[PDB]
Design an enzyme around this catalytic site. Sequence first.
Site, PDB file in Angstrom:
ATOM      1  N   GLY A  90       4.949 -17.190 -12.258  1.00 53.41           N
ATOM      2  CA  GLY A  90       5.343 -16.916 -10.879  1.00 53.41           C
ATOM      3  C   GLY A  90       6.517 -17.810 -10.492  1.00 53.41           C
ATOM      4  O   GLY A  90       6.659 -18.966 -10.995  1.00 53.41           O
ATOM      5  N   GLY A 114       1.969  -5.239 -15.711  1.00 54.22           N
ATOM      6  CA  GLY A 114       2.920  -6.049 -16.454  1.00 54.22           C
ATOM      7  C   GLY A 114       2.209  -6.669 -17.633  1.00 54.22           C
ATOM      8  O   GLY A 114       1.171  -6.186 -18.065  1.00 54.22           O
ATOM      9  N   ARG A 115       2.728  -7.806 -18.083  1.00 53.64           N
ATOM     10  CA  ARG A 115       2.231  -8.509 -19.265  1.00 53.64           C
ATOM     11  C   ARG A 115       0.748  -8.756 -19.164  1.00 53.64           C
ATOM     12  O   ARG A 115      -0.031  -8.396 -20.061  1.00 53.64           O
ATOM     13  CB  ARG A 115       2.983  -9.837 -19.475  1.00 53.64           C
ATOM     14  CG  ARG A 115       4.432  -9.661 -19.999  1.00 53.64           C
ATOM     15  CD  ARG A 115       5.239 -10.988 -20.060  1.00 53.64           C
ATOM     16  NE  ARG A 115       5.561 -11.558 -18.738  1.00 53.64           N
ATOM     17  CZ  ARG A 115       6.736 -11.417 -18.116  1.00 53.64           C
ATOM     18  NH1 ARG A 115       7.709 -10.729 -18.694  1.00 53.64           N
ATOM     19  NH2 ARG A 115       6.944 -11.970 -16.911  1.00 53.64           N
ATOM     20  N   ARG A 138       5.439   2.753 -16.109  1.00 57.83           N
ATOM     21  CA  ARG A 138       5.712   2.079 -17.368  1.00 57.83           C
ATOM     22  C   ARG A 138       5.057   2.905 -18.483  1.00 57.83           C
ATOM     23  O   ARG A 138       3.994   2.550 -18.976  1.00 57.83           O
ATOM     24  CB  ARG A 138       5.148   0.651 -17.341  1.00 57.83           C
ATOM     25  CG  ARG A 138       5.954  -0.390 -16.471  1.00 57.83           C
ATOM     26  CD  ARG A 138       5.044  -1.573 -16.153  1.00 57.83           C
ATOM     27  NE  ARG A 138       5.702  -2.679 -15.455  1.00 57.83           N
ATOM     28  CZ  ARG A 138       6.234  -3.729 -16.065  1.00 57.83           C
ATOM     29  NH1 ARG A 138       6.194  -3.822 -17.397  1.00 57.83           N
ATOM     30  NH2 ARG A 138       6.822  -4.683 -15.346  1.00 57.83           N
ATOM     31  N   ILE A 181      -5.812 -11.900  -8.845  1.00 59.93           N
ATOM     32  CA  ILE A 181      -5.326 -13.048  -9.570  1.00 59.93           C
ATOM     33  C   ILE A 181      -3.808 -13.277  -9.343  1.00 59.93           C
ATOM     34  O   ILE A 181      -3.232 -14.208  -9.914  1.00 59.93           O
ATOM     35  CB  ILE A 181      -5.707 -12.954 -11.076  1.00 59.93           C
ATOM     36  CG1 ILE A 181      -5.364 -11.568 -11.652  1.00 59.93           C
ATOM     37  CG2 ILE A 181      -7.228 -13.182 -11.243  1.00 59.93           C
ATOM     38  CD1 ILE A 181      -4.205 -11.564 -12.565  1.00 59.93           C
ATOM     39  N   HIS A 215      -7.674 -21.188  -8.520  1.00 62.86           N
ATOM     40  CA  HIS A 215      -6.408 -20.905  -9.224  1.00 62.86           C
ATOM     41  C   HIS A 215      -6.375 -21.471 -10.633  1.00 62.86           C
ATOM     42  O   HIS A 215      -5.485 -22.258 -11.002  1.00 62.86           O
ATOM     43  CB  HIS A 215      -5.233 -21.401  -8.402  1.00 62.86           C
ATOM     44  CG  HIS A 215      -3.968 -20.652  -8.661  1.00 62.86           C
ATOM     45  ND1 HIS A 215      -3.002 -20.464  -7.691  1.00 62.86           N
ATOM     46  CD2 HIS A 215      -3.522 -20.021  -9.766  1.00 62.86           C
ATOM     47  CE1 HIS A 215      -1.995 -19.789  -8.213  1.00 62.86           C
ATOM     48  NE2 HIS A 215      -2.282 -19.524  -9.473  1.00 62.86           N
ATOM     49  N   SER A 246      -4.664 -19.951 -15.868  1.00 66.55           N
ATOM     50  CA  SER A 246      -4.173 -20.469 -17.146  1.00 66.55           C
ATOM     51  C   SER A 246      -4.886 -21.744 -17.661  1.00 66.55           C
ATOM     52  O   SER A 246      -4.385 -22.434 -18.563  1.00 66.55           O
ATOM     53  CB  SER A 246      -2.649 -20.668 -17.084  1.00 66.55           C
ATOM     54  OG  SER A 246      -2.298 -21.417 -15.930  1.00 66.55           O
TER      55      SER A 246
HETATM   56  N1  LIG Z   1      -4.249 -17.039 -11.365  1.00 65.01           N
HETATM   57  C1  LIG Z   1      -3.303 -17.582 -12.180  1.00 65.01           C
HETATM   58  O1  LIG Z   1      -3.343 -18.870 -12.783  1.00 65.01           O
HETATM   59  C2  LIG Z   1      -2.059 -16.839 -12.524  1.00 65.01           C
HETATM   60  C3  LIG Z   1      -1.352 -16.048 -11.583  1.00 65.01           C
HETATM   61  N2  LIG Z   1      -0.205 -15.404 -11.980  1.00 65.01           N
HETATM   62  C4  LIG Z   1       0.474 -14.387 -11.157  1.00 65.01           C
HETATM   63  O2  LIG Z   1       0.523 -13.153 -11.858  1.00 65.01           O
HETATM   64  C5  LIG Z   1       1.808 -12.588 -11.781  1.00 65.01           C
HETATM   65  C6  LIG Z   1       2.099 -11.684 -12.983  1.00 65.01           C
HETATM   66  O3  LIG Z   1       2.612 -12.440 -14.058  1.00 65.01           O
HETATM   67  P1  LIG Z   1       3.139 -11.708 -15.387  1.00 65.01           P
HETATM   68  O4  LIG Z   1       2.357 -10.472 -15.684  1.00 65.01           O
HETATM   69  O5  LIG Z   1       3.351 -12.768 -16.398  1.00 65.01           O
HETATM   70  O6  LIG Z   1       4.551 -11.291 -14.751  1.00 65.01           O
HETATM   71  P2  LIG Z   1       5.193  -9.836 -14.646  1.00 65.01           P
HETATM   72  O7  LIG Z   1       6.614 -10.136 -14.380  1.00 65.01           O
HETATM   73  O8  LIG Z   1       5.050  -9.032 -15.899  1.00 65.01           O
HETATM   74  O9  LIG Z   1       4.668  -9.123 -13.282  1.00 65.01           O
HETATM   75  C7  LIG Z   1       3.615  -8.194 -13.257  1.00 65.01           C
HETATM   76  C8  LIG Z   1       3.790  -6.969 -12.344  1.00 65.01           C
HETATM   77  O10 LIG Z   1       4.214  -7.153 -11.002  1.00 65.01           O
HETATM   78  C9  LIG Z   1       4.499  -5.809 -10.660  1.00 65.01           C
HETATM   79  N3  LIG Z   1       4.857  -5.413  -9.288  1.00 65.01           N
HETATM   80  C10 LIG Z   1       5.936  -5.771  -8.505  1.00 65.01           C
HETATM   81  N4  LIG Z   1       5.834  -5.115  -7.322  1.00 65.01           N
HETATM   82  C11 LIG Z   1       4.699  -4.334  -7.345  1.00 65.01           C
HETATM   83  C12 LIG Z   1       4.089  -3.462  -6.428  1.00 65.01           C
HETATM   84  N5  LIG Z   1       4.819  -2.861  -5.501  1.00 65.01           N
HETATM   85  N6  LIG Z   1       2.916  -2.823  -6.774  1.00 65.01           N
HETATM   86  C13 LIG Z   1       2.335  -3.006  -8.023  1.00 65.01           C
HETATM   87  N7  LIG Z   1       2.940  -3.871  -8.905  1.00 65.01           N
HETATM   88  C14 LIG Z   1       4.090  -4.517  -8.579  1.00 65.01           C
HETATM   89  C15 LIG Z   1       5.414  -5.276 -11.751  1.00 65.01           C
HETATM   90  O11 LIG Z   1       5.286  -3.874 -11.794  1.00 65.01           O
HETATM   91  P3  LIG Z   1       6.390  -2.933 -11.145  1.00 65.01           P
HETATM   92  O12 LIG Z   1       7.729  -3.597 -11.405  1.00 65.01           O
HETATM   93  O13 LIG Z   1       6.374  -1.581 -11.845  1.00 65.01           O
HETATM   94  O14 LIG Z   1       6.102  -2.771  -9.674  1.00 65.01           O
HETATM   95  C16 LIG Z   1       4.695  -5.908 -12.930  1.00 65.01           C
HETATM   96  O15 LIG Z   1       3.791  -4.960 -13.387  1.00 65.01           O
HETATM   97  C17 LIG Z   1       2.763 -13.768 -11.660  1.00 65.01           C
HETATM   98  O16 LIG Z   1       3.961 -13.362 -11.019  1.00 65.01           O
HETATM   99  C18 LIG Z   1       1.931 -14.779 -10.887  1.00 65.01           C
HETATM  100  O17 LIG Z   1       2.136 -14.646  -9.501  1.00 65.01           O
HETATM  101  C19 LIG Z   1       0.251 -15.553 -13.263  1.00 65.01           C
HETATM  102  C20 LIG Z   1      -0.351 -16.310 -14.244  1.00 65.01           C
HETATM  103  C21 LIG Z   1      -1.585 -17.068 -13.949  1.00 65.01           C
END
Ligand SMILES: NC(=O)C1=CN([C@@H]2O[C@H](COP(=O)(O)OP(=O)(O)OC[C@H]3O[C@@H](n4cnc5c(N)ncnc54)[C@H](OP(=O)(O)O)[C@@H]3O)[C@@H](O)[C@H]2O)C=CC1
EC number: 1.1.1.79
Lengths: 324, 323
Positions: free
Chosen positions: B79, B157-158, B183, B238, B288, B291
Amino acid sequence: RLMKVFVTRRIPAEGRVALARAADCEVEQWDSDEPIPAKELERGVAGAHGLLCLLSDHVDKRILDAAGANLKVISTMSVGIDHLALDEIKKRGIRVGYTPDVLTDTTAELAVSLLLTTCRRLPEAIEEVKNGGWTSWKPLWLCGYGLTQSTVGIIGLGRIGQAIARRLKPFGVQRFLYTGRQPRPEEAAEFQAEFVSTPELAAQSDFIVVACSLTPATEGLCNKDFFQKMKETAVFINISRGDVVNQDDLYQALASGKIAAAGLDVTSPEPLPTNHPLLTLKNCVILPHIGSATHRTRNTMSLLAANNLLAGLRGEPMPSELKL
Amino acid sequence: LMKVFVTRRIPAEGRVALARAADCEVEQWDSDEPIPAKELERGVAGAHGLLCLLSDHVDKRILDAAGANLKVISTMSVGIDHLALDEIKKRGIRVGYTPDVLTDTTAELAVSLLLTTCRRLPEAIEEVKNGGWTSWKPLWLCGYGLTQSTVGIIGLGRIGQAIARRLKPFGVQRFLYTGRQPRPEEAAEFQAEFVSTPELAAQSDFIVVACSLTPATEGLCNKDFFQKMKETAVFINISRGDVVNQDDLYQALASGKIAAAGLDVTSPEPLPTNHPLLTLKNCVILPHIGSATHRTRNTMSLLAANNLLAGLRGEPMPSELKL
Ligand SMILES: NC(=O)C1=CN([C@@H]2O[C@H](COP(=O)(O)OP(=O)(O)OC[C@H]3O[C@@H](n4cnc5c(N)ncnc54)[C@H](OP(=O)(O)O)[C@@H]3O)[C@@H](O)[C@H]2O)C=CC1
Ligand SMILES: NC(=O)C1=CN([C@@H]2O[C@H](COP(=O)(O)OP(=O)(O)OC[C@H]3O[C@@H](n4cnc5c(N)ncnc54)[C@H](OP(=O)(O)O)[C@@H]3O)[C@@H](O)[C@H]2O)C=CC1
């Protein structure tokens, strides 16, 4: 000529209705969510043609005698069978119904739930929220034990042990090991699981999951000797029976740092006294025997148990009979 | 010597990397507790490099505090919603973050949370300690199974992908997802269907939110989201706190509009101990810890350090954020 049936508890509706419709039976029931005492059981089974019981009802020589020569079928709402006097039940020619398969996926689910809350430390994390311990995102705080590149040992790769392996595979598990009477290479292939000795299982696994039956062979299995061969970083999970685990040896090994943590779905006795030293350990998770607990599953087991009893009553094949 | 400010005690490996850098002058906030914004402004003055956490607020004031020296910001996280990216871009400052190394661990935690929540483990855990446990019971502590379920993932996403992959052998019959854009390649592994957000609420037995926090995700999970969800469904977040309308969630859970909620993130963090969501038996809240494995966290520490060093020396970074 109405056959008497005794049901030892309030059971889910699908099983209760199937019995109620049986116009060749009169159903007598322990109308309660609480376990029937043995002497109330002995009273109620008197002259019953069929018994519908649960895993926590002890169906020993005492209650088979209390029942007399009418008793022809005992239908248990469980896959476990250790609460039954099988030798005595056999001798008397009584049929047994139980509930395999029907509760397999759900129980596997619960086991992975428990393995993961324990290994990722969810209960003390939860408590750090409630108690004011949380102050920020912290890089070295509440770090748990991950399944990626891990080795998973299963004691007892039966249907439930297979379903657990299948659920842990996509978590990045590197290697599956398993122990028991004989290999099951057809079963194990799916996981490329290796058949090993208990000592090798203990020495090598990051995760140990016990999903075997309670026999003379498995009673007291996981003792001091076993926890001592275990890795200090390993997590121990038991969803089988309480009597597989020596709880004194478990507490010691948890308290001394011999293993990392344990999660139990099963205990000795059940319930475990709120007093027990196990309940004082932050690296021990204890659940109240909820492996098969979703309504749909319990509905399904209840109907299975009903249908086992009714067929057993009518001299017919059972959907799931246990033989000899 | 290039000046570095580090906003916390980081895991050893990364701290070691920074201690072995002869070109750098490294100052640490020598603590496990978060830095006051005021101490952060003093701390970053003159710095060429800032190694920071997802909970540090790197806004205009901290960039102006730091001054024209500042060349690299390296966050120990994936993030980035705590960085004023617009200002960073225009100042020409390079950014490092930590994608991929935490994907598996976070997905692991998210399924952990979904399972603790839907199989009612907290409630169960305490029936044991408080003497409510009296026997095995056929109708007691029954939760919600994954067999033949529909799971909706918001953000495939990932991490959303690593989540679905872990959810599949639990017998899920259908995956749906939503986002800005389909996707198709990644969807295919799960046969997932791209649907709107109202349709994803309507159909899903389980809802997982793994998205980034942007202006369009903010307050996405609100009264009307919760209104269209099944009364039997389970809600997992999450992503970030601000994706959820917290009051609407409290309201929904307390009135039985959804079955339960598991949250790894809240607004603010830490959630106060007397907050309304902490009074509900059908709400699970973790601090939180997505990870939180030591091995993932050291790899993150080391990443955050190498991204910093590489930026400081004008080199390609192991994982630079593209601005
Ligand atoms: N609890 C924890 O310790 C953790 C929290 N996080 C959070 O998880 C997030 C995801 O990380 P990661 O997967 O690595 O990053 P990614 O960059 O792969 O982001 C994941 C998703 O966000 C989506 N997204 C953006 N806008 C929208 C929306 N309108 N509706 C639905 N999806 C949307 C993108 O899809 P699309 O573009 O098609 O909309 C993408 O699928 C981080 O950004 C962080 O905030 C991360 C790691 C650990
Ligand atoms: N926690 C819960 O709510 C639930 C718990 N259970 C418990 O878990 C068990 C799972 O049984 P299920 O998979 O359905 O049926 P299985 O009989 O197939 O499982 C029992 C397993 O135990 C193994 N086993 C027997 N003896 C030993 C031994 N000495 N050492 C190691 N393994 C041994 C068997 O393998 P082998 O014969 O080759 O040794 C077999 O794989 C049940 O018997 C029950 O007690 C079941 C349902 C729900």
